[PDB]
Design a protein around this ligand. Sequence first.
Ligand SMILES: Nc1ccc2c(NCc3cccs3)nc(-c3ccccc3)nc2c1
Length: 329
Amino acid sequence: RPTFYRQELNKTIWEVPERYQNLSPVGSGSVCAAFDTKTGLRVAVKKLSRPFQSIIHAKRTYRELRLLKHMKHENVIGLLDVFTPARSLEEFNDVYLVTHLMGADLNNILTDDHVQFLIYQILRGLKYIHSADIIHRDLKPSNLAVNEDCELKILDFVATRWYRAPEIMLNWMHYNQTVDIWSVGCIMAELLTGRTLFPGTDHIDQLKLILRLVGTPGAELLKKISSESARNYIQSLTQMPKMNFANVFIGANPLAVDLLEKMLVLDSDKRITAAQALAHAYFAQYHDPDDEPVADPYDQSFESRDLLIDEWKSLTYDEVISFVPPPLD
Ligand SMILES: Nc1ccc2c(NCc3cccs3)nc(-c3ccccc3)nc2c1
């Protein structure tokens, strides 16, 4: 039960344990860079904004704490600490999250050898996340933290639609994990060209650019679309042939072109998985089957539950008290 110290930083007040020093605002819940006197590391402290404001907020706060507490992988952001100034459930209102301070994002950043290492680390993190039955859904360069060492970590908290799989913008329920692989393809394409692959102005224009590259679907994909309106609209467009990816990505590593062909597929049933992609020949120099682990089981059953604010709040308090700090190395 450490001593807490308070200071007003920009808008809001901050009450943190003494071990975290030299708070410096970084963004805006609010996030401060600080120095961790227990480990000697630079860390990011995030103070959640109104974490229990509504049923939706309280469950969202609970969801975020559960996910971060579960992630233990080199290419996924991990939780160093979670704390509150409160001494009891009764006075519990503020939640603070502490993670490693990550240098920059992929947006702030390329050789073919850099793209291999960077995309290999994303796919390595996605295999872990997907093995827990978790879908990211929001992969984009600003959700990828990169070191000065080119070490990459997937994060979660430049248009989001540019990286979204086409099934999500068509509002298909029952999409699978490969919506993330579509995002990887869009990211890898941008690192190889310097240009956004699908800079759509909106959701309609986004699909137009996507289909111009991958083509309008064939009858094998059409016979699996349940929506009659979506099926008619797609069938009424002028048929566009699939462009040759070697032509579009001219001068790139033919192994990189072959992988993009397997990631940017309309039919998500045919799209390549993270595990399958890790064994693609394009990653021969980094791929190690004995060092690409999967995650412990993750209980998502709370997602289907409707509870009161105080109950999500109490479940969140439980997760704060039961937190075991990660081992120091
Ligand atoms: N097994 C599969 C594989 C892909 C699918 C897909 N892909 C998005 C597009 C398909 C054709 C043009 S965009 N879209 C849908 C879908 C279903 C209902 C409403 C709207 C879209 N289903 C798919 C089922």
